[PDB]
Amino acid sequence: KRQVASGRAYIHASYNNTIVTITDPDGNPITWSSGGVIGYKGSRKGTPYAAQLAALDAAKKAMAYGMQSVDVIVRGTGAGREQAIRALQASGLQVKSIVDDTPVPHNGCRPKKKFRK
Amino acid sequence: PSRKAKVKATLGEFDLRDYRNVEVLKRFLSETGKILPRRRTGLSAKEQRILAKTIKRARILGLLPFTEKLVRK
Amino acid sequence: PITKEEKQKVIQEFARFPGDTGSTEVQVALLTLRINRLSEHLKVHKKDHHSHRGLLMMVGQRRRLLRYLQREDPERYRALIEKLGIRG
Amino acid sequence: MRRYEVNIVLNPNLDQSQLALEKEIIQRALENYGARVEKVEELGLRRLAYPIAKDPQGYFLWYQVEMPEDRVNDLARELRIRDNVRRVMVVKSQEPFLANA
RNA sequence: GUGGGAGAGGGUGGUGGAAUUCCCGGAGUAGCGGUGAAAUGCGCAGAUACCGGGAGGAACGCCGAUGGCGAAGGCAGCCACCUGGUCCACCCGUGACGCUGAGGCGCGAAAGCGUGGGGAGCAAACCGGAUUAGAUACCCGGGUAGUCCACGCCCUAAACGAUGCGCGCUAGGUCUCUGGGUCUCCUGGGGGCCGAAGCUAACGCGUUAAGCGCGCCGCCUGGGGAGUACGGCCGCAAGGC
Ligand SMILES: NC[C@@H]1O[C@H](O[C@H]2[C@@H](O)[C@H](O[C@@H]3[C@@H](O)[C@H](N)C[C@H](N)[C@H]3O[C@H]3O[C@H](CO)[C@@H](O)[C@H](O)[C@H]3N)O[C@@H]2CO)[C@H](N)[C@@H](O)[C@@H]1O
Ligand SMILES: NC[C@@H]1O[C@H](O[C@H]2[C@@H](O)[C@H](O[C@@H]3[C@@H](O)[C@H](N)C[C@H](N)[C@H]3O[C@H]3O[C@H](CO)[C@@H](O)[C@H](O)[C@H]3N)O[C@@H]2CO)[C@H](N)[C@@H](O)[C@@H]1O
Ligand SMILES: [Mg+2]
Ligand SMILES: [Mg+2]
Ligand SMILES: [Mg+2]
Ligand SMILES: [Mg+2]
Ligand SMILES: [Mg+2]
Ligand SMILES: [Mg+2]
Ligand SMILES: [Mg+2]
Ligand SMILES: [Mg+2]
Ligand SMILES: [Mg+2]
Ligand SMILES: [Mg+2]
Ligand SMILES: [Mg+2]
Ligand SMILES: [Mg+2]
Ligand SMILES: [Mg+2]
Ligand SMILES: [Mg+2]
Ligand SMILES: [Mg+2]
Ligand SMILES: [Mg+2]
Ligand SMILES: [Mg+2]
Ligand SMILES: [Mg+2]
Ligand SMILES: [Mg+2]
Ligand SMILES: [Mg+2]
Ligand SMILES: [Mg+2]
Ligand SMILES: [Mg+2]
Ligand SMILES: [Mg+2]
Ligand SMILES: [Mg+2]
Ligand SMILES: [Mg+2]
Ligand SMILES: [Mg+2]
Ligand SMILES: [Mg+2]
Numbered sequence: 191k192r193q194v195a196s197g198r199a200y201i202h203a204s205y206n207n208t209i210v211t212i213t214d215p216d217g218n219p220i221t222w223s224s225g226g227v228i229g230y231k232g233s234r235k236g237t238p239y240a241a242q243l244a245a246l247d248a249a250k251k252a253m254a255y256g257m258q259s260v261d262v263i264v265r266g267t268g269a270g271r272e273q274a275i276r277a278l279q280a281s282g283l284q285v286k287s288i289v290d291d292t293p294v295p296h297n298g299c300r301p302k303k304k305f306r307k
Numbered sequence: 308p309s310r311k312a313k314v315k316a317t318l319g320e321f322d323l324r325d326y327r328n329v330e331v332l333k334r335f336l337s338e339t340g341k342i343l344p345r346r347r348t349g350l351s352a353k354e355q356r357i358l359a360k361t362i363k364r365a366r367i368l369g370l371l372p373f374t375e376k377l378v379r380k
Numbered sequence: 381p382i383t384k385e386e387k388q389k390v391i392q393e394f395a396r397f398p399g400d401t402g403s404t405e406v407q408v409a410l411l412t413l414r415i416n417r418l419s420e421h422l423k424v425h426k427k428d429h430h431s432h433r434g435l436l437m438m439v440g441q442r443r444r445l446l447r448y449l450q451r452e453d454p455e456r457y458r459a460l461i462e463k464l465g466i467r468g
Numbered sequence: 469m470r471r472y473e474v475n476i477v478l479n480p481n482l483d484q485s486q487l488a489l490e491k492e493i494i495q496r497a498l499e500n501y502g503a504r505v506e507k508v509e510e511l512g513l514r515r516l517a518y519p520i521a522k523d524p525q526g527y528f529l530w531y532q533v534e535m536p537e538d539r540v541n542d543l544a545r546e547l548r549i550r551d552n553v554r555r556v557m558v559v560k561s562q563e564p565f566l567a568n569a
Numbered sequence: 570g571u572g573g574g575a576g577a578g579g580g581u582g583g584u585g586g587a588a589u590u591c592c593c594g595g596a597g598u599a600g601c602g603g604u605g606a607a608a609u610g611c612g613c614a615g616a617u618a619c620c621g622g623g624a625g626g627a628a629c630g631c632c633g634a635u636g637g638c639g640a641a642g643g644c645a646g647c648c649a650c651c652u653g654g655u656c657c658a659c660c661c662g663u664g665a666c667g668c669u670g671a672g673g674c675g676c677g678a679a680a681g682c683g684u685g686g687g688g689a690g691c692a693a694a695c696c697g698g699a700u701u702a703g704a705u706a707c708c709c710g711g712g713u714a715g716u717c718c719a720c721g722c723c724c725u726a727a728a729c730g731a732u733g734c735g736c737g738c739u740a741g742g743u744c745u746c747u748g749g750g751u752c753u754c755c756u757g758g759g760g761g762c763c764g765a766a767g768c769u770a771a772c773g774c775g776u777u778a779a780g781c782g783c784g785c786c787g788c789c790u791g792g793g794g795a796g797u798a799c800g801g802c803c804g805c806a807a808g809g810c
């Protein structure tokens with residue numbers, strides 16, 4: 191019970207999962223979804239398919255609030271990153287634009303051993 | 308690639324040490340705020356070296372971005 | 381640092397004749413200048429070694445030139461040392 | 469003494485009297501630190517790449533100047549004291565360098 | 570000497586943004602995370618994902634290079650002060666003042682030690698979860714010293730070009746950094762690749778010699794025992810020579 195109808199779509203994509211959050215233009219979230227919100231449990235959350243279902247669940251819940259068009263913002267490089275975008279592409283939502291906001295350091299913080307090299 | 312054009316060619320005469328000229332310097336940044344390599348800027352070693360500096364100065368002053376959000380995609 | 385007027389001043393002081401630039405006396409005066417300026421810099425910044433090596437090398441050159449001078453013309457040696465106030 | 473450039477950026481929101489107030493504060497701080505002012509360019513409001521103290525614009529000032537080297541940093545420190553003073557930078561002036569001269 | 574040049578060379582004080590974490594607020598809900606797969610873990614005391622505000626510690630993305638600098642160790646955001654080296658041009662000054670260097674002395678990555686701060690992230694030990702025949706490991710979740718600053722020790726190393734320093738002499742071709750020139754070319758200083766002669770056991774080296782010569786230093790003399798024992802010296806200790 192809001193009636194936002196125009197908003198942002200944040201796609202947070204790791205190698206382990208894909209989380210679609212949908213917000214009003216000021217960034218405050220109305221609904222969200224993930225590979226784990228969809229029935230999946232294990233590694234399968236980081237699946238392109240899982241990403242598709244995440245996105246469509248999110249988009250559905252958004253349109254229920256009255257949502258029309260989104261601004262897509264992609265963070266993270268993972269499988270099903272593009273599948274999420276392609277999912278919202280025709281979700282029954284217009285995609286007004288896509289930005290890649292993936293955070294990068296100017297080299298301030300030491301990585302976990304797994305990420306070093 | 309980078310054969311679209313070189314930056315040095317598109318611009319005329321201009322002052323590399325001038326950190327306050329925004330329109331001149333912005334031409335040397337990518338979609339992001341990144342400083343283009345020479346194969347883009349078409350500068351020389353000495354040139355590119357001074358460019359890096361003055362671009363950074365401009366950044367601290369707030370005239371140039373440190374980084375910028377990638378659109379389209 | 382050292383401005384050109386400082387240099388010119390100490391040169392004209394220690395020059396053997398008008399226009400003497402590189403005679404042993406003027407070389408030792410100049411070395412003593414840069415040396416004492418450096419040592420003053422190294423009172424503070426006691427943690428800057430890369431310069432300290434410089435100082436060592438300067439002292440080296442100076443000591444060698446003073447050894448040369450003492451060998452060739454002892455009188456000029458004494459003169460120079462006294463004027464500069466070094467070595468004792 | 470040496471030749472420096474004092475870049476000042478102020479709050480875009482200052483009214484006239486507060487602006488000239490800040491500028492006079494600058495004049496005084498310069499004189500007291502012994503800085504003789506050779507050239508001045510007041511660019512005023514300009515949009516910035518990123519926000520500075522949450523404000524999207526900034527008020528630009530440029531002073532070509534000659535001052536004793538030893539004093540410079542101190543002066544800089546003084547300049548940064550004011551709240552209205554957003555950014556301060558001091559550059560040793562240089563002969564320009566031209567590409568495609 | 571004079572006049573020009575380039576550089577992450579060094580020290581001090583400021584300073585800038587990105588990111589991580591933490592705190593407060595908003596909005597929001599059923600999971601997040603992680604792996605080969607999981608589990609521990611975190612989450613209804615509302616996490617994850619999103620916006621806003623704040624605090625802090627550390628490291629500086631693009632430029633960035635097969636690049637530069639330094640005696641080496643090493644050196645990378647920006648700014649100012651201080652400061653070492655160095656190269657080119659002029660051919661002005663001194664008049665062999667040179668070279669090397671036992672011992673001495675100074676420097677000397679990391680880890681480690683002392684004192685005092687600091688502590689975001691990472692992380693020896695350690696505590697768990699996995700895996701396995703076991704797993705005192707690899708993988709996952711935590712996590713202390715530490716990693717950070719000051720001062721003081723420590724003196725090691727694949728401290729490597731595994732190549733001491735200086736000087737003279739011996740085809741060129743090519744790429745590059747930086748000076749100067751009457752600037753298609755000439756000329757220096759530096760970093761690379763192929764290669765004359767020549768060297769080399771071979772690999773390779775080859776005007777950046779591992780070629781031809783001269784000076785001086787350090788060093789070697791089969792493998793194991795062993796960088797051990799003892800002695801001395803150094804060190805707070807670990808330990809070093
Ligand atoms: N930029 C200052 C530099 O500080 C160096 O060392 C300084 C810095 O390490 C440190 O300054 C402050 C410190 O007081 C304060 N307690 C915390 C703060 N984060 C530090 O600042 C610094 O921290 C580290 C360096 O360790 C950097 O990664 C960071 O960028 C910088 N902001 O404390 C030291 C004393 O001021 C050197 N003196 C010199 O390079 C220069 O002055
Ligand atoms: N290395 C420091 C950096 O020097 C650069 O500039 C440096 C160089 O461009 C310049 O080189 C000059 C040279 O032009 C001039 N013709 C002769 C002079 N001796 C040289 O200076 C050199 O030697 C002296 C000792 O005599 C040192 O004090 C100084 O650090 C060193 N650069 O000296 C400057 C100071 O070192 C940066 N602009 C500066 O920001 C930064 O501090
Ligand atoms: Mg997963
Ligand atoms: Mg020597
Ligand atoms: Mg430096
Ligand atoms: Mg931050
Ligand atoms: Mg909250
Ligand atoms: Mg539980
Ligand atoms: Mg925030
Ligand atoms: Mg070398
Ligand atoms: Mg500044
Ligand atoms: Mg004569
Ligand atoms: Mg020697
Ligand atoms: Mg002694
Ligand atoms: Mg050490
Ligand atoms: Mg250490
Ligand atoms: Mg402590
Ligand atoms: Mg951890
Ligand atoms: Mg661990
Ligand atoms: Mg274990
Ligand atoms: Mg087995
Ligand atoms: Mg077990
Ligand atoms: Mg300690
Ligand atoms: Mg220490
Ligand atoms: Mg090596
Ligand atoms: Mg070599
Ligand atoms: Mg070398
Ligand atoms: Mg030229
Ligand atoms: Mg090198």
Ligand SMILES: [Mg+2]
Nearest residue numbers: 765766767768
């Ligand atoms: Mg042959």
Ligand SMILES: [Mg+2]
Nearest residue numbers: 762772773774
């Ligand atoms: Mg080979």
Ligand SMILES: [Mg+2]
Nearest residue numbers: 763764774775
């Ligand atoms: Mg060869």
Ligand SMILES: [Mg+2]
Nearest residue numbers: 759760776777
């Ligand atoms: Mg060569």
Ligand SMILES: [Mg+2]
Nearest residue numbers: 768769774779
């Ligand atoms: Mg041989």
Ligand SMILES: [Mg+2]
Nearest residue numbers: 787788789796
């Ligand atoms: Mg031996």
Ligand SMILES: [Mg+2]
Nearest residue numbers: 787788789810
């Ligand atoms: Mg031995």
Ligand SMILES: [Mg+2]
Nearest residue numbers: 791792793794
């Ligand atoms: Mg035997």
Ligand SMILES: [Mg+2]
Nearest residue numbers: 791792793794
């Ligand atoms: Mg034997």
Ligand SMILES: [Mg+2]
Nearest residue numbers: 725796808809
């Ligand atoms: Mg041993």
Ligand SMILES: [Mg+2]
Nearest residue numbers: 798799800801
């Ligand atoms: Mg013993």
Ligand SMILES: [Mg+2]
Nearest residue numbers: 803804805806
């Ligand atoms: Mg003892």
